[PDB]
Scaffold this active site. Structure first.
Site, PDB file in Angstrom:
ATOM      1  N   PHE A  53      26.638 -24.190  13.598  1.00 58.03           N
ATOM      2  CA  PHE A  53      26.541 -25.121  12.470  1.00 58.03           C
ATOM      3  C   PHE A  53      27.896 -25.722  12.138  1.00 58.03           C
ATOM      4  O   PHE A  53      28.013 -26.919  11.872  1.00 58.03           O
ATOM      5  CB  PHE A  53      25.984 -24.414  11.227  1.00 58.03           C
ATOM      6  CG  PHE A  53      24.616 -23.800  11.415  1.00 58.03           C
ATOM      7  CD1 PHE A  53      23.840 -24.087  12.561  1.00 58.03           C
ATOM      8  CD2 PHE A  53      24.102 -22.934  10.440  1.00 58.03           C
ATOM      9  CE1 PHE A  53      22.562 -23.537  12.721  1.00 58.03           C
ATOM     10  CE2 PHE A  53      22.835 -22.377  10.585  1.00 58.03           C
ATOM     11  CZ  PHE A  53      22.055 -22.679  11.728  1.00 58.03           C
TER      12      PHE A  53
ATOM     13  N   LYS B 258      29.000 -34.038  10.384  1.00 55.25           N
ATOM     14  CA  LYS B 258      27.980 -33.615   9.432  1.00 55.25           C
ATOM     15  C   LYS B 258      28.597 -33.233   8.079  1.00 55.25           C
ATOM     16  O   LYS B 258      28.161 -33.712   7.024  1.00 55.25           O
ATOM     17  CB  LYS B 258      27.173 -32.452  10.007  1.00 55.25           C
ATOM     18  CG  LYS B 258      26.152 -31.853   9.047  1.00 55.25           C
ATOM     19  CD  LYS B 258      25.421 -30.630   9.676  1.00 55.25           C
ATOM     20  CE  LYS B 258      26.421 -29.600  10.174  1.00 55.25           C
ATOM     21  NZ  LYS B 258      25.824 -28.209  10.224  1.00 55.25           N
ATOM     22  N   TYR B 259      29.601 -32.357   8.074  1.00 53.10           N
ATOM     23  CA  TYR B 259      30.043 -31.882   6.776  1.00 53.10           C
ATOM     24  C   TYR B 259      30.767 -32.981   6.023  1.00 53.10           C
ATOM     25  O   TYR B 259      30.691 -33.039   4.790  1.00 53.10           O
ATOM     26  CB  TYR B 259      30.875 -30.588   6.927  1.00 53.10           C
ATOM     27  CG  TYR B 259      29.927 -29.460   7.234  1.00 53.10           C
ATOM     28  CD1 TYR B 259      28.934 -29.135   6.329  1.00 53.10           C
ATOM     29  CD2 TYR B 259      29.955 -28.795   8.453  1.00 53.10           C
ATOM     30  CE1 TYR B 259      28.025 -28.158   6.587  1.00 53.10           C
ATOM     31  CE2 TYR B 259      29.043 -27.792   8.739  1.00 53.10           C
ATOM     32  CZ  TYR B 259      28.070 -27.484   7.798  1.00 53.10           C
ATOM     33  OH  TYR B 259      27.135 -26.505   8.036  1.00 53.10           O
TER      34      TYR B 259
ATOM     35  N   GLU C  57      23.844 -17.242  -1.282  1.00 54.73           N
ATOM     36  CA  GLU C  57      23.485 -16.930   0.095  1.00 54.73           C
ATOM     37  C   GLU C  57      22.748 -15.598   0.115  1.00 54.73           C
ATOM     38  O   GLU C  57      23.254 -14.599  -0.422  1.00 54.73           O
ATOM     39  CB  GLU C  57      24.738 -16.881   0.984  1.00 54.73           C
ATOM     40  CG  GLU C  57      24.487 -16.482   2.447  1.00 54.73           C
ATOM     41  CD  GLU C  57      23.362 -17.314   3.118  1.00 54.73           C
ATOM     42  OE1 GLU C  57      23.523 -18.542   3.312  1.00 54.73           O
ATOM     43  OE2 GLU C  57      22.311 -16.715   3.431  1.00 54.73           O
TER      44      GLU C  57
ATOM     45  N   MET D  31      17.556 -17.723  -3.617  1.00 54.80           N
ATOM     46  CA  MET D  31      17.633 -18.762  -4.619  1.00 54.80           C
ATOM     47  C   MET D  31      16.351 -18.850  -5.427  1.00 54.80           C
ATOM     48  O   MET D  31      16.380 -19.363  -6.537  1.00 54.80           O
ATOM     49  CB  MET D  31      17.974 -20.106  -3.960  1.00 54.80           C
ATOM     50  CG  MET D  31      16.805 -20.861  -3.317  1.00 54.80           C
ATOM     51  SD  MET D  31      17.381 -22.357  -2.460  1.00 54.80           S
ATOM     52  CE  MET D  31      18.286 -21.604  -1.093  1.00 54.80           C
TER      53      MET D  31
ATOM     54  N   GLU E  91      21.512 -26.906   2.803  1.00 53.18           N
ATOM     55  CA  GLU E  91      21.364 -27.265   4.206  1.00 53.18           C
ATOM     56  C   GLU E  91      20.219 -26.444   4.781  1.00 53.18           C
ATOM     57  O   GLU E  91      20.361 -25.636   5.709  1.00 53.18           O
ATOM     58  CB  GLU E  91      22.680 -27.060   4.946  1.00 53.18           C
ATOM     59  CG  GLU E  91      22.673 -27.492   6.434  1.00 53.18           C
ATOM     60  CD  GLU E  91      24.038 -27.230   7.096  1.00 53.18           C
ATOM     61  OE1 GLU E  91      24.951 -26.609   6.448  1.00 53.18           O
ATOM     62  OE2 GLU E  91      24.192 -27.652   8.263  1.00 53.18           O
TER      63      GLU E  91
ATOM     64  N   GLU F  68      11.916 -25.149   7.881  1.00 59.87           N
ATOM     65  CA  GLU F  68      12.503 -23.895   7.430  1.00 59.87           C
ATOM     66  C   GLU F  68      12.074 -23.553   6.014  1.00 59.87           C
ATOM     67  O   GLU F  68      12.527 -22.524   5.466  1.00 59.87           O
ATOM     68  CB  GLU F  68      14.036 -23.934   7.548  1.00 59.87           C
ATOM     69  CG  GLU F  68      14.481 -23.957   9.037  1.00 59.87           C
ATOM     70  CD  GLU F  68      15.963 -24.146   9.247  1.00 59.87           C
ATOM     71  OE1 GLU F  68      16.735 -24.141   8.252  1.00 59.87           O
ATOM     72  OE2 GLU F  68      16.365 -24.335  10.408  1.00 59.87           O
TER      73      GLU F  68
HETATM   74  C1  LIG Z   1      17.251 -23.271  17.830  1.00 58.62           C
HETATM   75  N1  LIG Z   1      17.571 -23.937  16.576  1.00 58.62           N
HETATM   76  N2  LIG Z   1      16.620 -24.097  15.634  1.00 58.62           N
HETATM   77  C2  LIG Z   1      17.253 -24.701  14.659  1.00 58.62           C
HETATM   78  C3  LIG Z   1      18.606 -24.946  14.965  1.00 58.62           C
HETATM   79  C4  LIG Z   1      19.631 -25.540  14.079  1.00 58.62           C
HETATM   80  C5  LIG Z   1      20.772 -26.197  14.579  1.00 58.62           C
HETATM   81  C6  LIG Z   1      21.735 -26.702  13.727  1.00 58.62           C
HETATM   82  C7  LIG Z   1      21.599 -26.548  12.339  1.00 58.62           C
HETATM   83  C8  LIG Z   1      22.598 -27.058  11.430  1.00 58.62           C
HETATM   84  O1  LIG Z   1      23.625 -27.658  11.748  1.00 58.62           O
HETATM   85  N3  LIG Z   1      22.398 -26.867  10.086  1.00 58.62           N
HETATM   86  N4  LIG Z   1      21.314 -26.179   9.555  1.00 58.62           N
HETATM   87  C9  LIG Z   1      20.397 -25.706  10.339  1.00 58.62           C
HETATM   88  C10 LIG Z   1      19.199 -24.976   9.710  1.00 58.62           C
HETATM   89  N5  LIG Z   1      19.136 -25.204   8.258  1.00 58.62           N
HETATM   90  C11 LIG Z   1      20.486 -25.867  11.795  1.00 58.62           C
HETATM   91  C12 LIG Z   1      19.521 -25.372  12.695  1.00 58.62           C
HETATM   92  C13 LIG Z   1      18.785 -24.411  16.219  1.00 58.62           C
HETATM   93  C14 LIG Z   1      19.872 -24.242  17.154  1.00 58.62           C
HETATM   94  C15 LIG Z   1      20.495 -22.969  17.239  1.00 58.62           C
HETATM   95  F1  LIG Z   1      20.074 -21.960  16.395  1.00 58.62           F
HETATM   96  C16 LIG Z   1      21.492 -22.682  18.129  1.00 58.62           C
HETATM   97  C17 LIG Z   1      21.941 -23.691  19.004  1.00 58.62           C
HETATM   98  C18 LIG Z   1      22.965 -23.448  19.950  1.00 58.62           C
HETATM   99  C19 LIG Z   1      23.392 -24.443  20.799  1.00 58.62           C
HETATM  100  C20 LIG Z   1      22.788 -25.715  20.752  1.00 58.62           C
HETATM  101  C21 LIG Z   1      21.791 -25.971  19.848  1.00 58.62           C
HETATM  102  C22 LIG Z   1      21.338 -24.967  18.952  1.00 58.62           C
HETATM  103  C23 LIG Z   1      20.293 -25.214  18.023  1.00 58.62           C
HETATM  104  C24 LIG Z   1      19.695 -26.514  17.972  1.00 58.62           C
HETATM  105  N6  LIG Z   1      19.191 -27.531  17.919  1.00 58.62           N
HETATM  106  C1  LIG Z   2      22.541 -23.578   7.153  1.00 56.87           C
HETATM  107  S1  LIG Z   2      21.065 -22.550   7.527  1.00 56.87           S
HETATM  108  C2  LIG Z   2      20.292 -22.186   5.929  1.00 56.87           C
HETATM  109  C3  LIG Z   2      21.273 -21.225   5.186  1.00 56.87           C
HETATM  110  O1  LIG Z   2      20.788 -20.929   3.863  1.00 56.87           O
HETATM  111  C4  LIG Z   2      20.344 -19.560   3.784  1.00 56.87           C
HETATM  112  N1  LIG Z   2      19.123 -19.518   2.993  1.00 56.87           N
HETATM  113  C5  LIG Z   2      17.859 -19.935   3.373  1.00 56.87           C
HETATM  114  N2  LIG Z   2      16.993 -19.738   2.419  1.00 56.87           N
HETATM  115  C6  LIG Z   2      17.605 -19.210   1.388  1.00 56.87           C
HETATM  116  C7  LIG Z   2      17.171 -18.811   0.121  1.00 56.87           C
HETATM  117  N3  LIG Z   2      15.816 -18.943  -0.288  1.00 56.87           N
HETATM  118  N4  LIG Z   2      18.042 -18.280  -0.739  1.00 56.87           N
HETATM  119  C8  LIG Z   2      19.329 -18.133  -0.386  1.00 56.87           C
HETATM  120  N5  LIG Z   2      19.792 -18.515   0.825  1.00 56.87           N
HETATM  121  C9  LIG Z   2      18.953 -19.040   1.723  1.00 56.87           C
HETATM  122  C10 LIG Z   2      20.190 -19.104   4.995  1.00 56.87           C
HETATM  123  O2  LIG Z   2      20.382 -17.631   5.056  1.00 56.87           O
HETATM  124  C11 LIG Z   2      21.329 -19.803   5.832  1.00 56.87           C
HETATM  125  O3  LIG Z   2      22.499 -19.186   5.628  1.00 56.87           O
END
Ligand SMILES: Cn1ncc(-c2ccc3c(=O)[nH]nc(C[NH3+])c3c2)c1-c1c(F)cc2ccccc2c1C#N
Ligand SMILES: CSC[C@H]1O[C@@H](n2cnc3c(N)ncnc32)[C@H](O)[C@@H]1O
Lengths: 302, 625
Positions: free
Chosen positions: B315, B321-322, B380, B408, B423, B432
């Site tokens: 992430f 993104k950020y 978190e 939350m 996020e 999610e």
């Molecule tokens: C399998 N998956 N499902 C969801 C995600 C994923 C990816 C990026 C992000 C991200 O910024 N931000 N937030 C979230 C979830 N809230 C997130 C989730 C992934 C994922 C992952 F868990 C690991 C990876 C490792 C290498 C390349 C790609 C991924 C990907 C992808 N797409």
């Molecule tokens: C960036 S991936 C989503 C992030 O938020 C967290 N998260 C998801 N749902 C909740 C929730 N209901 N309360 C607190 N944290 C959460 C997850 O543990 C992860 O770190």
């Protein structure tokens, strides 16, 4: 054991053709084992064939001999496994066979080759689906034709018309060619056609054989089930009223009359029969060769 | 670095040929393992008793060389679908014979032609071979873009060539391939060697091969042009096709003889290298995504599961993104706090799902750049990430940040937020349960507070990909429904596929959800115009989200946030491929379903034919609340 002549001739005999004086031309392929090559041989004594130590001349080729034909009295025109059409020539002494040209114009095995009327041009057909017209003196392709849609199994030059020849193909077409025409091919109206022979005494008449063993007589229809397998070749004899020799993967040779009726049958061969050629000297003698390494001299009753 | 092979039909001596080929630069050699004219008889005497050896010895190459350098070729006389019964029988026996020799030798692939419409018996013999020992060997089906019958010279005076467009007719050879692989039941060992002619067909004919398992592209030397200096080159159109094929990392095969005899023969191959070197390198994204192409992934469930350290690292490796988040927070702070109040008005910001801290730092950087004061809560529920946060808090953030180790939806907040930042989005936006989590946090958002993101929308698009369909199919597992793999989505960097219609919005969610009757279930019907003949295998999913105003995040292709690495597409498969003709409409139905424990999706095609309803009652796939 003449000079630059390989000690051993390859197992799979592919072609046998007499010239005027009666010297016998042989073409051979090694179709198995370590080396897949070919060779060319002249026997001024045909009864010594295929014994190498008693040949007049011989030479190794780089690839196998899928087909050949005399060009005149000293030239040999070869369809090669390598995609090449090759022209070799005997020396003045007729003790060496010498490569004259080797041109790689086809993109797959060259399967069939035929000298046109004039003796100065030849046509070749290949698994690459093309047919090419060659100028033998300039050693160049004059025309390349992609009329067929599958491998070109046979091409046969017209006996007296220098612009006319036949071809057949696994696309199930028999094509009559006349290069005097804007579109030079024409489709002549089954099982795949596999072999062609012009009638030597009738301009517009030919015979063709098919993959199912049938021989057919065609004007520009009469037919008989002669063979139990593919008809590999068709050779009219030199007689005023000719006989028709036919050969087959069924390992037999048949001799047929004007109406395709059988007058003679030979089963001497123990493998595929690959060529047949009539003696110019003794018109009732007919020589065959096959992948069993036999050269058989049939006396055909007339 | 193009991986390339030479195709020959004439090999007088293996060792000499292999040397010549290697010296010219090729990586492998496709050749016959029996002499191509050596027709053999299996039934009729005397020919069936032909003394051996039937071919060349396996001792002529090392095991490593058979295993890595040699591709075998089915002899051209072998015709299992001949109309002559005897030829069909000899051909079946000869086909089994050569295939078994190939397996005997450990060859890594074996070439077979599709050069006509009816290959039923050839497919049956191949399928029989495939079910005769489990082996990894590949079968490359040699199939042209354009049938020879459809490219022959127009030289037959009494059979002219067609001059009128035959839309489906010009796709006939794709049909040869599709029927063959259907008969062989989508064996994973069966792939395409696509043969390219001097003249390319319409684009739609070429695009028919999108999503097919193309392992090799065959270039005859006759299709190459000649430049001023005499060297073989390709027309701009063929160059276009080559570039497209390099993107699939196919292997290129050079067939035919050398027609530029003035130049040597590595020339054809050097040109390929030249094209390969000329194209834009890995543009950050593609650098990152090349290893993941068509690699199926379980979608993360960060609610139900506690994400691993290295997952948060992924992430965090996406600064574009950020800094979008930072810009959203920045604009909001300004809209909410007039300049005259910049020293009195402290805004309460809550990061809801703070992970290891990147939104916390984005919030802090946003406040500095806005010259406004913020009080931060970092919420978190993953206690392992809470460790990272509390070391950050002690070492860096100090008292300005309060870390809350809590769900939350359960946290009793000690005050209300001006802005909640989160996020919680997946590749399908809401998969999610971001809606459920923000709903449960809503009570502690001020009456005029802002959620960042403010809304998101998932998007769907029908796709063709026999490759992906086969990958899903291979996900059968021991102790579950033998079809469950088709009733669940996958995150995947979709690569070898054909998008069949423009993505359309599916489900949308807004926060805060003022509405007095919150229902997060959904039922959506989509109609996708399809202007090609094709086969439907699933639906690609993407999302867009509004962080604040015009600051967005998006993985929908036509609005992809440029330079952002995070989030690959998602894929919903269907159990049975569905044939779709040009001009038809694909109608799909998607449901978002829930109970108190789980949320899930169900989906169904209802035009041009109905599928089964996929994942009824969450039986194959649920998302835990
Ligand atoms: C399998 N998956 N499902 C969801 C995600 C994923 C990816 C990026 C992000 C991200 O910024 N931000 N937030 C979230 C979830 N809230 C997130 C989730 C992934 C994922 C992952 F868990 C690991 C990876 C490792 C290498 C390349 C790609 C991924 C990907 C992808 N797409
Ligand atoms: C960036 S991936 C989503 C992030 O938020 C967290 N998260 C998801 N749902 C909740 C929730 N209901 N309360 C607190 N944290 C959460 C997850 O543990 C992860 O770190």
């Amino acid at each position: 054991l003449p000079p630059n002549a390989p000690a051993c001739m390859e197992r799979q005999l592919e072609a046998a053709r007499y010239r005027s004086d009666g010297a016998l031309l042989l073409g051979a392929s090694s179709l198995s084992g370590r080396c897949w090559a070919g060779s060319l041989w002249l026997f001024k004594d045909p009864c010594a064939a295929p014994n190498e130590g008693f040949c007049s001349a011989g030479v190794q080729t780089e690839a196998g001999v899928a087909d050949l034909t005399w060009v005149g009295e000293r030239g040999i025109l070869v369809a090669s496994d390598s995609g090449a059409v090759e022209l070799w020539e005997l020396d003045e002494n007729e003790t060496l066979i010498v490569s004259k040209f080797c041109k790689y114009e086809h993109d797959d095995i060259v399967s069939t080759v035929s000298v046109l009327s004039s003796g100065t041009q030849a046509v070749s057909g290949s698994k690459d689906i093309c047919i090419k017209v060659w100028d033998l003196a300039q050693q160049v392709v004059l025309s390349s034709y992609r009329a067929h849609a599958a491998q070109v199994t046979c091409v046969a030059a017209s006996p007296h018309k220098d612009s006319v020849f036949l071809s057949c193909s696994e696309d199930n077409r028999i094509l009559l060619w006349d290069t005097r025409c804007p579109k030079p091919a024409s489709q002549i109206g089954g099982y795949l056609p596999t072999s062609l022979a012009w009638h030597p005494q009738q301009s517009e008449v030919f015979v063709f054989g098919d993959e199912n063993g049938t021989v057919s007589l065609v004007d520009t229809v009469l037919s008989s089930a002669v063979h139990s397998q593919c008809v590999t070749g068709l050779v009219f004899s030199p007689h005023s009223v000719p006989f028709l020799a036919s050969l087959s993967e069924d390992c037999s040779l048949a001799v047929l009359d004007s109406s395709l009726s059988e007058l003679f049958r030979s089963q001497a061969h123990r493998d595929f029969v690959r060529d047949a050629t009539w003696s110019p000297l003794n018109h009732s003698l007919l020589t065959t060769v096959g992948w069993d390494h036999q050269v058989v001299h049939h006396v055909v009753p007339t | 670095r193009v991986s390339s092979g030479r195709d020959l039909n004439c090999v007088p001596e293996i060792a000499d040929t292999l040397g010549a080929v290697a010296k010219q630069g090729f990586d492998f050699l496709c050749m016959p393992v029996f002499h191509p004219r050596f027709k053999r008889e299996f039934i009729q005497e005397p020919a069936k008793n032909r003394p051996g050896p039937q071919t060349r010895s396996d001792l002529l190459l090392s095991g490593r060389d058979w295993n890595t350098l040699i591709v075998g070729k089915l002899s051209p006389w072998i015709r299992p679908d001949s109309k002559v019964e005897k030829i069909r029988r000899n051909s079946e026996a000869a086909m089994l014979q050569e295939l078994n020799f190939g397996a005997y030798l450990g060859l890594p692939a074996f070439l077979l032609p599709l050069n006509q419409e009816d290959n039923t018996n050839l497919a049956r013999v191949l399928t029989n071979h495939i079910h005769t020992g489990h082996h990894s060997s590949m079968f490359w089906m040699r199939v042209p873009l354009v049938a020879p019958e459809d490219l022959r010279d127009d030289i037959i005076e009494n059979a002219p060539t067609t001059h009128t467009e035959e839309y489906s007719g010009e796709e006939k050879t794709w049909m040869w391939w599709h029927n063959f692989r259907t008969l062989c039941d989508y064996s994973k060992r069966i792939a395409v060697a696509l043969e390219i002619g001097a003249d390319l067909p319409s684009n739609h004919v070429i695009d028919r091969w999108l999503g097919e398992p193309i392992k090799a592209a065959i270039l005859p030397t006759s299709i190459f042009l000649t430049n001023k200096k005499g060297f073989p080159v390709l027309s701009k159109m063929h160059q276009r096709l080559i570039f497209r094929l390099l993107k699939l990392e196919v292997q290129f095969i050079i067939t035919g003889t050398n027609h530029h005899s003035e130049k040597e023969f590595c020339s054809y191959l050097q040109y390929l290298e030249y094209l390969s070197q000329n194209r834009p390198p890995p543009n950050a994204y593609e650098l990152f995504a090349k290893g993941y192409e068509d690699y199926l992934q379980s979608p993360l469930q960060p609610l139900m599961d506690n994400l691993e350290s290295q997952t948060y690292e992924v992430f965090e490796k996406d600064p574009i993104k950020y800094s979008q988040y930072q810009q959203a927070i920045y604009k909001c702070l300004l809209d909410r706090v007039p300049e005259e109040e910049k020293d009195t008005n402290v805004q309460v910001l809550m990061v809801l799902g703070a992970g290891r801290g990147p939104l916390v730092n984005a919030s802090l950087r946003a406040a500095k750049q806005a010259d406004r004061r913020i009080k931060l809560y970092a919420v978190e529920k993953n206690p392992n990430a809470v460790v990272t946060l509390e070391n950050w808090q002690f070492e860096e953030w100090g008292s300005q940040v309060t870390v809350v180790s809590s769900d939350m939806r359960e946290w009793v907040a000690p005050e209300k937020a001006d802005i909640i930042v989160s996020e919680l989005l997946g590749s399908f936006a809401d998969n999610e349960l971001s809606p459920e989590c923000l709903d449960g946090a809503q009570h502690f958002l001020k009456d005029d507070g802002v959620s960042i993101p403010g809304e998101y929308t998932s998007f769907l698009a029908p796709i063709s990909s026999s490759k992906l369909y086969n990958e899903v199919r291979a996900c059968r597992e021991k102790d579950r429904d033998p079809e469950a793999q088709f009733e669940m989505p996958y995150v995947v960097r979709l690569h070898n596929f054909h998008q069949l219609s423009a993505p359309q919005p599916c489900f949308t969610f807004s926060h805060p959800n003022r509405d007095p009757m919150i229902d997060n279930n959904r039922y959506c019907t989509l109609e996708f115009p399809v202007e090609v003949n094709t086969v439907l295998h699933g639906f690609a999913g993407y999302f867009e989200t509004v962080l604040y105003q015009d600051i967005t995040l998006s993985i929908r292709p036509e609005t992809h946030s440029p330079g952002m690495f995070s989030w690959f597409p998602i894929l919903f498969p269907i159990k049975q491929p569905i044939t779709v003709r040009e001009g038809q409409t694909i109608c799909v139905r998607f449901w978002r379903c829930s109970n108190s424990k789980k949320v899930w999706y169900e989906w169904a095609v209802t035009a041009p034919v109905c599928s089964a309803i996929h994942n009824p009652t969450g039986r194959s796939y649920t998302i835990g609340l």
